[model samples]
Target: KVFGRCELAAAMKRHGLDNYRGYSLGNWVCAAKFESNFNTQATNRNTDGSTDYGILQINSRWWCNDGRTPGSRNLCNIPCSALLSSDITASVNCAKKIVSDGNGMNAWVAWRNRCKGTDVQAWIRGCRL
Candidate 1:
């Protein structure tokens, strides 16, 4: 795991997350909270047999390859396992690529369903970085 919410926010800021790809830090925080609860080891299997991996819960159908899933786009050119590491650099890079692909945070279902239109002020509250 990276850190709790406040520390995550500070780390993210140090990692240059503010205004990344035109999205706010709050959006990233909210999405991270809902997607993995800041747990880098988090993984979930989707109903379609594809799996979501790591902090952003990036899906195997379009992002990374789990080897078992055939025809994966593997657009991130990374193994699904790479996203599950405590070191989140690779995952952050892949997530930036994903957002740059024009999906914005919409690539993350958790962002759309849970973070979007919600009060995200508290996600970064009291964090000074």
Candidate 2:
């Protein structure tokens, strides 16, 4: 739970998004669960010839500039078991930039739709960034 919270916060912070409580957080958690099983230690080799790893499923190419073997950057640099590690905030930030660089809250709201696949912010506190 604690690690999840950290990943959650870091992810939001990286994108300059606000932390959600109640339903928004719940929705994110739900989406994360389905997307990556809420595993901060998750990694997937994509069909696009790339790899997505760690919380928020950061692409290896983005995580490391090269996107080649050994993944562009060292997972040790990020701190979490390359998957569960949270060393530097860069990985989380990168994901945030991709998902929430412009329109801030609006981006999150949009993301919610994609992740939640339903309009269920009834339980959400107003979106923030």
Candidate 3:
């Protein structure tokens, strides 16, 4: 499913990602904007052969196991296919783990370039929290 900006913000908050790990939910919303355009089935393939999956674009190399990432740690302990679900629960949980694992939101270059240190308030302004 493809979500609008405000819609995605609400979904993130529903999963308790609001201000999680000190990053505002808007910060997350912005990342998702550029990461996957809020599409649950979004994917990107790395030049090195790993693939990014889901709304947050979790990478197969270190996050999910597609059985061919070459150095997959399966740190999220789920199949890459799981991240593509429209419900997004598994994706949200894995993203939380990514933040909890110390990579933080910096794990996504899109977040770094579009949201990091920028006022993410603009990302969620019209959305009711």
Candidate 4:
């Protein structure tokens, strides 16, 4: 499912992304905009040959098991296919795991390139949490 701007933000908040790991809900929402454009089924093949899956683009390289990323870490311990569902609970949990590992939200190159800096505060101003 593709989420509307406010719809995705509210969903992230409801899934416990608000102020998660010192990264505000806005960052998550902003990243999701550029990451998968709020599409639950999005996937991108990495240049290194790994696949990124789901709304937040959880990667197969060191994250979910896609059965193709040789020596897959599957750190999230779920199939890559698991993240493609419209219900985002699985990917949300995985995102928290990624954040809890002390990696900044910059773990997402999309977030690094686009959602970095303080712009997301205004990006979220119209969205009533």
Candidate 5:
């Protein structure tokens, strides 16, 4: 069930998380569960109807929009095509940084609770490096 292994590894390398003992496949899965229920094609809307797109739920208006070009927010954007291809890890890490910065793994903790299984943490603990 693991997705984006190489792509995610590259993103981790970009952010120096390649060596992160703090990160795991389970951690990424935990984020995916809450972010978009593991759906690469998921999208959502803001009150004004601008969209958040892809598995990581990146907001196009807030992140990137070619329609909003010249002022495009590339650093915050997760292009849907990129996401579909294998850039998912980059997107997930970006979401983690935006939502929590240094404390974003808390999102994983929150996601685990929402999963409603007694073994969630245990599963994470048992995940191999």
Candidate 6:
């Protein structure tokens, strides 16, 4: 995991996550917290047999190719392993594209359930971005 939430915010800011793709940094930070607890290597298997990858929990069904999964649109055209890296650049870029596709942060279920309409300032509190 990251050193702490502040570190995660700094990393995200360095990767251009501050107000990227028309979404606020608060949205991204809050979504990431709930999606993966700021863990870059996080992954989860869905009941539908697809898996989510990385901090944003991007779906193998649409965003990245896991190789074993069939019918993945692979719209991001990156390997799922790329998303699992501690370096979050690729994952953040893919997330930007996903947001630009008209989904906004709603693409992440965690955002909807845990962050939507909430006071998400805590995600960026004390971070020197």
Candidate lDDT (C-alpha), each: 0.87, 0.48, 0.91, 0.89, 0.51, 0.86
Across 55-82, the per-residue lDDT of candidate 3 in tens digits comes to 9999998889998889789999999999
Q: Which of the numbered candidates is closest to the native, going by highest TM-score?
A: 3
Pairs in clash, predicted candidate 1: none
At residue 40, give the lDDT of candidate 2: 68
Q: What residue runs in model 6 are displaced by over 4 Å at the alpha carbon?
A: none
lDDT of 2 by residue, 1-129 (tens): 224544564454444433433224545544455446556666677666666665556655444433354545533344323444644255445544554544532333334556555653432334342
Predicted model with the maximum lDDT: 3
Q: Residue 61: error of model 3 in Å?
A: 0.8
Q: Which lDDT tens digits does candidate 6 get at residues 1-129?
A: 553788888888888888887667788888888889889889999987789999899988889999867888999989999999988888988998898888777888899999989988778887787
TM-score-better candidate, 4 vs 5:
4
Candidates 1 and 2, the one with greater lDDT: 1
Each model's TM-score? 0.92, 0.49, 0.95, 0.94, 0.51, 0.93
Candidate 6 is scored at a TM of 0.93
Stronger candidate by TM-score (2 vs 6):
6
Clashing pairs in 5: none
Poorest 10 consecutive residues by lDDT, candidate 6: 1-10
For candidate 4, the TM-score is: 0.94
